[PDB]
Structures are given as structure tokens and as C-alpha cells.
Amino acid sequence: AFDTLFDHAPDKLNVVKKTLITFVNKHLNKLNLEVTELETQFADGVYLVLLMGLLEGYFVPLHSFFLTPDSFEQKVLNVSFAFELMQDGGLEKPKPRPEDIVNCDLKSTLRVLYNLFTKYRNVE
Amino acid sequence: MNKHSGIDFKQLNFLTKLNENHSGELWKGRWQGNDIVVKVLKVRDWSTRKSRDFNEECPRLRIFSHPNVLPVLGACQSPPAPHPTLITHWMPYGSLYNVLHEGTNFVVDQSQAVKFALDMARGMAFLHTLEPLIPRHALNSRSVMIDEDMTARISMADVKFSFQSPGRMYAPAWVAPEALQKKPEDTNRRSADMWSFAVLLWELVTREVPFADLSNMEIGMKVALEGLRPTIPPGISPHVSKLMKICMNEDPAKRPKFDMIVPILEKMQDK
Numbered sequence: 001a002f003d004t005l006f007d008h009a010p011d012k013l014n015v016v017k018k019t020l021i022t023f024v025n026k027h028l029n030k031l032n033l034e035v036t037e038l039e040t041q042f043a044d045g046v047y048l049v050l051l052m053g054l055l056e057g058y059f060v061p062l063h064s065f066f067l068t069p070d071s072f073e074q075k076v077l078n079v080s081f082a083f084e085l086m087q088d089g090g091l092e093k094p095k096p097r098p099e100d101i102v103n104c105d106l107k108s109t110l111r112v113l114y115n116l117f118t119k120y121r122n123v124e
Numbered sequence: 125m126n127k128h129s130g131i132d133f134k135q136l137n138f139l140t141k142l143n144e145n146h147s148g149e150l151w152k153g154r155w156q157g158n159d160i161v162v163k164v165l166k167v168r169d170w171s172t173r174k175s176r177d178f179n180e181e182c183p184r185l186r187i188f189s190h191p192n193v194l195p196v197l198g199a200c201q202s203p204p205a206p207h208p209t210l211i212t213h214w215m216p217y218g219s220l221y222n223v224l225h226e227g228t229n230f231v232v233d234q235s236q237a238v239k240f241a242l243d244m245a246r247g248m249a250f251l252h253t254l255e256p257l258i259p260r261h262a263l264n265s266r267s268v269m270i271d272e273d274m275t276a277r278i279s280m281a282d283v284k285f286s287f288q289s290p291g292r293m294y295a296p297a298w299v300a301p302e303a304l305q306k307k308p309e310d311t312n313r314r315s316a317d318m319w320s321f322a323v324l325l326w327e328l329v330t331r332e333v334p335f336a337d338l339s340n341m342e343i344g345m346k347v348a349l350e351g352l353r354p355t356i357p358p359g360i361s362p363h364v365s366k367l368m369k370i371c372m373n374e375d376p377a378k379r380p381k382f383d384m385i386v387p388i389l390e391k392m393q394d395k
């Protein structure tokens with residue numbers, strides 16, 4: 001379904017990407033964080049964790065994840081933890097493995113971001 | 125046989141639903157001649173391990189020996205109950221938060237505010253005598269309740285349980301900077317609670333919600349990493365300013381103990 005928005009309407013795909021860009025900055029700019037590139041800026045899990053707290057109304061204690069991950073393994077742990085926060089919030093288990101996000105799979109990343117966007121468009 | 129069977133869920137009279145959120149549901153009800161609040165907990169991936177843990181954690185909350193501590197009357201074990209459930213007494217004025225910030229009918233005066241402060245300091249000093257400390261108890265204005273005679277009481281029913289996510293913190297404005305960043309086992313938990321009391325003092329002085337204009341994420345990140353602090357209120361006595369500054373010392377080890385500020389607050393009472 002989302003795969004058709006991805007592959008066989010590449011000017012819709014870019015509009016999906018431009019939609020997801022506006023959405024994440026609406027929230028992350030509150031922390032003075034800017035996203036200009038969806039292909040890489042969520043790969044280390046940090047912005048996904050911060051975004052979840054912004055969307056669902058909590059702070060994430062800094063000992064709960066790696067704010068400055070120093071390894072592929074720590075980035076996988078961050079993404080897995082963000083996936084758990086997603087499930088805490090009512091989303092079903094995400095399809096991609098956490099390593100798919102760490103490896104900058106644009107489809108895996110936009111799928112996760114799109115499911116967040118479908119659920120949370122209207123949060124101020 | 126088990127040492128506690130807990131409260132029988134079948135004996136609860138559920139009267140009216142008060143609230144529902146991420147953590148569960150609150151109901152007003154009745155049980156064995158008591159007017160109660162029931163909290164039905166929402167838990168993902170409930171398990172026998174988590175249920176065993178719930179049943180070991182709840183007995184510590186049944187504290188009947190201090191006027192400024194509100195006990196959990198008991199808990200429903202799940203199984204056999206549908207969900208892990210807590211029972212406490214209905215407090216007619218609700219939380220301190222509601223009395224200070226959502227009080228549509230009266231504004232408590234500053235003599236009452238100073239009495240609330242003394243009440244809370246006495247209850248915290250008592251809780252800090254327990255060995256070990258009750259874990260996962262966060263002091264803030266939502267976790268203090270106001271009883272029928274306006275006595276403030278620390279709510280034991282508002283503790284967090286081991287199976288509730290430690291990664292989601294919903295009242296960071298009251299949390300000490302070190303506790304936003306370090307695991308509990310790496311902090312002095314008593315000194316962290318004194319920071320929370322300092323923020324309660326600020327709230328009693330300003331009658332404002334701390335950092336009300338910011339999201340919980342913004343609050344935690346800015347307090348932890350950008351040095352955001354409550355602004356010391358203008359036009360208060362040097363004595364109140366001094367107390368609030370020492371309770372909010374950046375160095376946890378320099379903050380007073382609750383049993384040190386109890387006599388200070390006693391002298392601040394009208395009576």
C-alpha cells in the first residue's frame with residue numbers, strides 16, 4: 001500500500017517526503033533541532049526517541065537511551081527502544097528491523113515516519 | 125499459601141469513572157464501608173513475572189502510621205482480577221495540583237500554603253526513614269492529595285511500578301536535574317526528592333504550574349542540558365527566598381534533609 005506511494009508515483013513519494021519533513025520539524029524545532037534530510041538524520045535512533053516524547057507528551061530520561069551513540073550497536077538499541085515507545089503509544093510492532101533504520105533504508109525510514117505521521121498529524 | 129490475598133476485585137463497587145489515560149483508569153467507588161478511588165492499571169505484555177512483582181511491591185504502600193502519608197488500602201492481584209488494580213481513600217479536595225491550579229471556588233491563602241508545605245515535609249521526612257526507600261516514588265503536586273480537613277498527604281498510590289516504563293517521564297518539571305540524566309541507583313534519591321520539594325515551594329509561591337508553557341520533552345531536555353531553572357519570584361520574603369534556594373541547590377549533597385526543614389516550616393506557621 002505505502003509501497004505504491006513509494007515506487008510508482010515518485011513525485012507523490014517526494015510529496016510524502018516533503019510532508020514528513022514539515023511534520024518532524026514542527027516538533028524537533030522545539031528542541032532547537034532541524035531535519036533537512038530524511039535519508040540519514042533518523043538512522044541513529046536519537047531523533048525518533050525525542051520525537052516520540054514530543055508526540056506523546058513525556059520526557060525520556062537520558063539514561064534510557066544513547067543520546068550520542070558511539071557504535072552501530074548503540075544505534076540499533078536506540079531504534080529498538082524508539083520502536084518500544086511506539087508500541088507503548090498504541091502502534092503495532094513496526095515492520096522494519098531496527099538495523100534497517102540504522103542502515104538508512106529510505107523505505108524502512110519513511111514507513112516508520114509515515115505511521116507516526118498518520119497517528120499524530122494534529123498534535124500541537 | 126500466600127501471605128496476602130489482596131483485596132477481592134469482586135467486592136469493589138465501581139460508581140463513576142473519573143479519568144482515563146496512558147497509565148490506566150481512575151474510578152470513584154466503595155469497598156467495605158470506605159469511599160475509595162480505584163486505579164485499574166494499563167500494562168503492555170503482562171506476565172506472571174510482572175504480576176509477582178506487583179504483588180511484592182504493593183504491600184510496601186500500605187502505610188497507616190503517618191497523617192501526611194495516604195496509604196494504598198490494598199491491591200487486586202491479577203490473576204484472579206481482570207487487571208492489576210490499586211485502591212486508596214477518596215480525598216475530597218483532590219490533588220494539590222487541582223487545589224492550586226484548578227480551584228474554581230476558592231483560592232487557598234498563604235497560611236494554608238505554608239501548612240501544605242509543612243504537611244508534605246513531614247510526610248517526606250517519614251518516608252525517608254524507611255529502609256529501603258519506597259522505590260519509584262516521584263514527589264510533585266499531582267502525587268500529593270488534600271484530605272477532608274485540608275491536610276496534605278503524600279499519595280502512595282501514585283508510585284510507579286517496576287513494569288511501568290522508566291523511559292517515559294510525565295512530570296519532569298519537579299524532577300532534580302541529576303535524576304533527569306542518571307539512573308536512580310546512581311543518584312541520592314533523598315536529595316533528589318528535596319529538589320522536587322523546592323519546586324513545590326515555587327508552585328505554592330507563584331500559584332503557577334512550573335514551566336507551564338513547555339512540553340514535558342522541552343522541560344526535561346532544557347533542565348538537563350541547558351540549565352533551565354524556575355525564576356525566583358519577585359517580592360517574596362528573604363526567608364522564603366532563602367529556603368527555596370537551599371532546597372534547590374545545584375549540588376544534591378548541599379540540599380537539606382526533610383527533617384531539617386520541618387522545624388523551619390513549623391516556625392513559619394501562624395499557629
Ligand SMILES: C#Cc1cccc(Nc2ncnc3cc(OCCOC)c(OCCOC)cc23)c1
Pocket residue numbers: 142143150161162163210211212213214215216217218219222269279281282
Ligand atoms: C488507587 C488510586 C489512585 C492512584 C493515583 C491517583 C489517584 N487519585 C485520587 N486519589 C484519591 N482521591 C482522589 C480524589 C479525586 O477527586 C476528588 C474531588 O476533587 C475535587 C481525584 O480526582 C481525579 C480527577 O477526577 C476527575 C483523584 C483522587 C488514585
